[PDB]
Amino acid sequence: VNIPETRQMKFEEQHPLLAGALRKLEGQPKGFPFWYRKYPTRRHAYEYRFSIPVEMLDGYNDDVKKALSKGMMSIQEKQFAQEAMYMERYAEHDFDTTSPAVLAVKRALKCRVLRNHLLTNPHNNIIKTVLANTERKLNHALRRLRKVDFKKYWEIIRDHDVQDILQPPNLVTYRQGSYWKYDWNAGLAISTNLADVMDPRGLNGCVETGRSRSEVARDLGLSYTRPLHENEKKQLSHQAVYYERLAKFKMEQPEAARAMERERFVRKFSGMFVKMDIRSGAPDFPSTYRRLLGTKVVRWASKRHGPN
Amino acid sequence: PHDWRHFYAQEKLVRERQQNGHAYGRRPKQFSFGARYVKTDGYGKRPRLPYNK
Amino acid sequence: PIEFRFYQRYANHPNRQSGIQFLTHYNTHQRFRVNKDYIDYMHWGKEQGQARLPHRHQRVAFDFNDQLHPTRIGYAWFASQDPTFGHHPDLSSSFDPNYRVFSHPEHWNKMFTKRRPGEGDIDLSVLPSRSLLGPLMAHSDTKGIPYFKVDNRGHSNGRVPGVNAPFFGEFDQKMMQAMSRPLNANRTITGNDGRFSKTIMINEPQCNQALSAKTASELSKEIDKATNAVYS
Amino acid sequence: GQVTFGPRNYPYPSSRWLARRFQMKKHRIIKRFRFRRYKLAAVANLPFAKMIRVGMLPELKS
Amino acid sequence: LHQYPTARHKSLVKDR
Amino acid sequence: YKMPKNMGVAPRFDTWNEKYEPWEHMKRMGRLVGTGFYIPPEWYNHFRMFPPINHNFQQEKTLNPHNASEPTQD
Amino acid sequence: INYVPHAQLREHIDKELDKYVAGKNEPYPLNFVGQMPFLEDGDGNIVEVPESLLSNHMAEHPDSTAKPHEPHTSSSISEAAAFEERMLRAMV
Amino acid sequence: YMMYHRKAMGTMKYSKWKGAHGGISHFYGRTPMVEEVRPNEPITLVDRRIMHYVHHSRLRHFQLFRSYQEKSNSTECKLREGEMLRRRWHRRLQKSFIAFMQFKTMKVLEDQARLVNTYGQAAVNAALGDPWNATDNVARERKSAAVRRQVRALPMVNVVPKHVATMKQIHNDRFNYRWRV
Amino acid sequence: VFYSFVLVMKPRQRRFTSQALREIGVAVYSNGGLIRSITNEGIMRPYSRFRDADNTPLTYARYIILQLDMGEEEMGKVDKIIREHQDVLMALKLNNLERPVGIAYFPLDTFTRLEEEINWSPQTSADIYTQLEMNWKEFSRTRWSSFLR
Amino acid sequence: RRREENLYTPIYDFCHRIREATEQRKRFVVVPSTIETRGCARVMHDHGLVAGFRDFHNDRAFAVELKYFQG
Amino acid sequence: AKAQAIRIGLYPRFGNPFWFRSQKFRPKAYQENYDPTTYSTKRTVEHFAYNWVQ
Amino acid sequence: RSGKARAFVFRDPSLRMMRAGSGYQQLRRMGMPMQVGMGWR
RNA sequence: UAUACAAUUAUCAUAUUAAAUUGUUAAGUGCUGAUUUAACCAAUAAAAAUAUAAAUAAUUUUUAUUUGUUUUUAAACACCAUUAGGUA
RNA sequence: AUUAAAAAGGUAUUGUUGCCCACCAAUUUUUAUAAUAAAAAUAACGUGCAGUAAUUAAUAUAUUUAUAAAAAUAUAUUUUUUUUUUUU
C-alpha cells in the first residue's frame, strides 16, 4: 500500500516555501518537522511503522529504513494501513472519521478481513456474530449515505461491480414498504435537492384543477419518463399499433369483422345482467357479494383476488 | 460455597457477556490427555468456548 | 420467610442480589441487569457499606453530613484569603470520576478452570502498572507535557475563580448560595427560605455589588417583604 | 409439567419431592415407548416378514 | 396422583 | 438443611430503630395530648419547647458509613 | 545498534563462537543466565569445566579430561589486593 | 499409567518399570526437593521437616486427593472454594482473638508498670536480672553463656499426622477418624 | 525488537555449528529479513533431559539468542524452518517484546531497545543504574551533534 | 432493552430517583434536565415540597436539594 | 515466565533450585521481635505469656 | 411462578380516575365514533 | 350465569454488542520378579504445561446463527457374563 | 496419672409399628370407533423397599438394562450435616 500523490501535490501547492525546503534538503538530516502540515494525524502516515513519516527517516542508516519499511509490518498494521489509505480517499477532510462514506469503507474492509479469517478458520462463532453485526452496520451506513449523495455511490460501488449490495432482506417486509422506511426513520426521508437533479416545475400537481403530475407535465411540455426495459416498450408499441391495424383490417377484410360484430351483438343479449344495475356495476363482484359465493354461485372460489 | 451464590452468579454473568450472551454456566468440553498431539488434521485440538463450539 | 410473602420489594433469587437501586448512573435501574460494572461482593464495601451500593467516586446522592465530590485541579490562588488557610479540603489534584476498581468476578475470573491458585483469566488494564519497566522505557531527555505545553483546551470551564483565576470573596462550604432561587426579575436578588429563617443575597459580581436604582428598589421590596413575613 | 412450581423468590430451582412425581411420569412414558419400539422392531423377525421379502424379491433375467 | 389421609382430615393433619 | 438456631427470633436489622426513634414518640404523644383526654407527661411538656434535631437519620436508613449523623457521637 | 550484515555474517559468527576459547588474560563475560558455562577450545571440544559442575562432569562420563576452569583473578582493579593474595599464597 | 496412579510402579512378572534410574534418571528433572544431608543433621529429622512442610502447606492433601481417585472438576472447585471460605472465616475469627490477646498484654504491661511504681525502677531491673552483682566480667559472662545457649533455636517442626486408610477410601486425603461429607 | 528466538542445540563441532548458523542466517535473509543480533553462550546444563541422536538424554546443550525483525508471513516460514532443523534441539519464540505487559501507549520505546534491557538478566546489579546514568548523559549530550554531521 | 419492557421517560426516572433519595434520607439529588422536569421541580419548590432546585446549565442533569420534617 | 523456562529447559518441572538462596529475600518473622499484625495468634500468646512470666 | 402478580399497595384512586381521560365512554360522549346503524328505536 | 392483573426485584427452554481462534511437546531397561482392591482381577507402563496490549455505546438482532451425544495411542468406561471379563 | 467435658436430622403429625413409590390386582369415568392411544378416581391384596440426614448421598440431561419401585454409566449441580496453612 502507498499514499496517493495528490497529498504531495496539494502540500506543494499550499505551502511553496516548505515544499521547496524539503526538496532542497532531500538527503540531508533535518531537525525541524516541515511535514507537520502534510501529516495532520497518526493514521495519515502508514508507509512506515509507528506512523513514522518518510521525510523523518533521512539522516538514518538504510538498515533502520528497511526495519521500518513496509516489509516489517504485522498483519494488524497492514490492515490498519490499508484501512487508513482507503479512508483518507473518501474523508471530506483530514479529521473526517464520522461521515457515512468513511464509516462504510472502514466497515467494508473489516468485513473483508473477517471473511478471509473465517475462510481460513471457520470455528469462531464469535467471529461469525461480529461479522454479521459489522455487515448490519455497513448496510446502515450505506443506507444513510444514499440520501446525502449518490455520486460517491457511482464512484465506490463500481468496486468489483457489485451493483447489488443493500439487497432487500425479505419480500414479506419489502412489499409493505418497510425497506424504504429506513430512509424515513433515519431523518433523511426527503433531502435530495430536487431542482438540481430534475426540473421541479413538472413534478407536482395543480390543487385548483386537481390534475395530476402527468397532466402538469403534458401541459408544460415536459416528460418525466423513467428508463424502460424491453417488455414495457413492446407492450406500448403493441397497444399503439391497434388503431392503425384495425382501420385497415376493417376495410380490407370486412367479412371476419362483421362475423365478430354479429357474435358480440348476440352475446350482449345472451349474457348475465344485461341491465347495468348496482349488482352488475359492482367492480369486485365476489368481494361485494360473499354470502352467495358458496351456495348460489360457483364461478369464483376465493372471495377476494386483489389488495382491496 | 452455596452461601456465596451471588459471587459465582457474577462470574457466570461475566462469562456469558463475554461469549455473546448465549451460554450461561456452561464449561468447555473435556478433551483427551494428548488431544492437541494425537488428533489428526481437520479436527479441533484446543477446546473452544461453549458458544464457539 | 419475608421473601416468600413480599416479592415486589425483595428478591431472593440468586443473581438478583444487586437490587433495584435508581441512584446509579447506569443505563438501567436494574443493577443486576446492567452490564457495565459487576459487583465483587467478597471484597467491596470497605468504605461504602454494602457491596451493591455505588462507589464513593460514582455517587449521585449526598447526605447532609457527607462531603461532596472534590473538584479536580490537576495555596497559589488563596493569597487574598486567610494566609494560614491551608489547602481547601474540597480541592483534589488526583480525582477520577470514572475510575475503574479491581473486581475479581470481572477482572480475575477463574470459573473456566479448576480454580487452582496458578490460573485464572486476568486483564491488566484495570490497574496502572507498578513495574519499573514503565518509567525506564518512558524516560526521555526532553521534559514532559507540562513543560512542552501541548494542551490548548486547559480547564473545561472557561474561568474558575478557585483554579484558573485568583479566588476572592468568602468561602461557602455548604451549598447555600449555589442552591437558591432569584426573587428579582433580573436575577440580582436571590433568596433562600427555611422554615423560619430567610436569607437574602445580593449577586452583582460584575459591578462589585453595586446597586442601581431599579436594583435598590427591588432589594428594598424584598427586604421589607421578608422582614414582614409571618414566619420570619 | 411445571417442574419449577416453587413459590415466589424460592432460592432453589424446584422442590425435591415435587420433582420425583415428574421424574416418575417421564420414566414411565420413556419405558413404555421403548418397550413398544422394541416390540414393533422385533415384529420384523416373524416369518410373515420372510414371506413379504420373498414376495418383494425381483426377477433377475440374463 | 393425590396424597390423602383416610383416617384423619387433611386440614386437621396440616394445621400443626 | 442448616439454619441458625436463633434465625427465627432474629431481629429485623432494618426496622428495629423506627420503633424507638424519638420523633415517632414525639408525634404520637402530640396527637394523644391534642385529643384533649390525655394528661401530658413531663417529658412531653418539656420537649415540646425543645424538640430534637431534625437531621439525625440513622445509618440503617442512610446506608452510608461515612455519614456523621450524630453531632454528639461524631 | 548495529545489525549483523550478510557480508560480515561469518566473521560475526566466528567471533561469537570464539568468545569462549578456554584461554584468555581477561575475565570471561557471563551468559544471559549469569553463569560460567564450559570453556571450549577449537573444533568443538570441551576442555575446561567450572568447579561447581566439575563433579557432575566427571561422573556422567569418565576418562574425559577437563582442567577445572578458574576465573582470572582481578589485580588491575586494586593493586593492594594482588599483593595481599600473593602474600597469602606465600604463607600457604 | 501415570506415575502417581494406583497401579504405577507395580512389581509383577510381566511388568517392567519404565524409565532409566540412577545418575541422570527419570526423576532427574522431576525431583521437587533435594537436600544435602550433612553430619550432625539426621536424615530422619530431614525427612520429618520435609513432611511437616508438605503437610502444613496443604500440598500432600491435594497430591493424594488428585492422585488416588478421580474427582470431577465441579467437586474440586466446590472443595477448594469451601476451604477458602472456611479459611477466611477462621482468619476473621482469629483476628478478634489476636486483638483481645493484645489487650491482655496491655493489661499485663500496666500491672508491670504498677509493680515498677510500687518497688522502684532499679529494684524491678534487679528482679528482672540486671547484672548489678557482676563485680568481675566472669559473673556477667555466666549469664551471657546462659542466654547464648538459650538463643539456640532447634527445628520447630513437629510430628506429621498419620494417614488413615478407610474402607473403599471415600476420601483419600483423610488424616483423622472424624467423618466428613 | 520485533522477534527474538532462543535455541538450544547439540554441542557439535565448531564447523558443524558454523554451518547450522549459516543455514539459519541464509534462511532468514532469503525472505528479506534483518537479524538484529545473534549471541552465542557456552555449553550449558539444562535441567530437563533432551534426547540426542542415540535416543539418550544429553544434559549438555549450547544456547543461541537470535533477535531479529521480520513480518509475520515470513516469520512463520522461518520459524518452521528453524524448528524443523535437526541441530536445533529446541526453540522458544518471544513475540510480546513490542508490547510488554509492563506497558498513550508509545510503541517506539521498546522497539528500539534490545531484549536484554526489556528483560533484565540475573547477573545485573545496582551499578547498572550508574551505567545507565552515564550512557544517558553522554547520549543526550552527543546525539544531535552526531546527527547533524 | 426489549419490547416487553416499559418505555421509560425522563419524568418517570426523575420521580423514582427523587422518591428513592427521599426514602434513603439524602440531601442532594442529581436528576435529568428537561424543560418538563425543570418545571416540575420549580412547582415543587414553589409548593415547598422541595427545599430547593438549581439548573446548572449542563445538558444532562441538574440538582435538587430535598426537605425533611420531624425526622 | 515459568512456562517459558520449563519449555526451554532453564527451570525444573518440579521444585526450585534457589529455595535456600531465596530465604534472605523472603521475609523472616523473628520470634524475638514481635509483629503486631501477625497472622497467627500463637506468636502473640507467646509474648503475652512472656510478659506475664516477667 | 404459576400465580399472578400482586401490587404492594393500592393504586391511588385519583390517579386511576385521571388515567381514564380517553376511555371509550368519553370517546362516545365526545362523538368520535361515527354512526352508521339505526341505534335505539 | 354477568361484575377492574401488574408495571420497585416473579428460577424451565424468548440467546441477540460480543474477541475470539490457532501454537509439536512429553514419555521409551530384560532379566529370576506377589502390583491394585472390602474382595476378585488380565499381560511393557510411562507420558502431552506459553500469556497480554488490540476489535466502538447507538439509531433495521427484526437479518446469518448458537448453548455438556462431536468418531484414533494410553488411562477411565454403562447393558452382559460369573470365578469373574467386556463396555463412551 | 492419661479423663467425663464439640457440631451435626423429619418428606413424618396416625409422627418409623410413619408417610410415600411403581408394579400386581379390582371397580369405573373421559377423549375416541380406529384390531387405537392417552389420562383420571379408588382403606385393607401381591412383590418389594425406591425416596423421606433413610444404610454405596441427592438433583438435572443423555444412553442402557427390566417383574416393579429403579439401577449403572457419560456430562453438569447440591433444597449433602461443617471442621483453622497470610513467602517454613
Ligand SMILES: [Mg+2]
Ligand atoms: Mg431405601
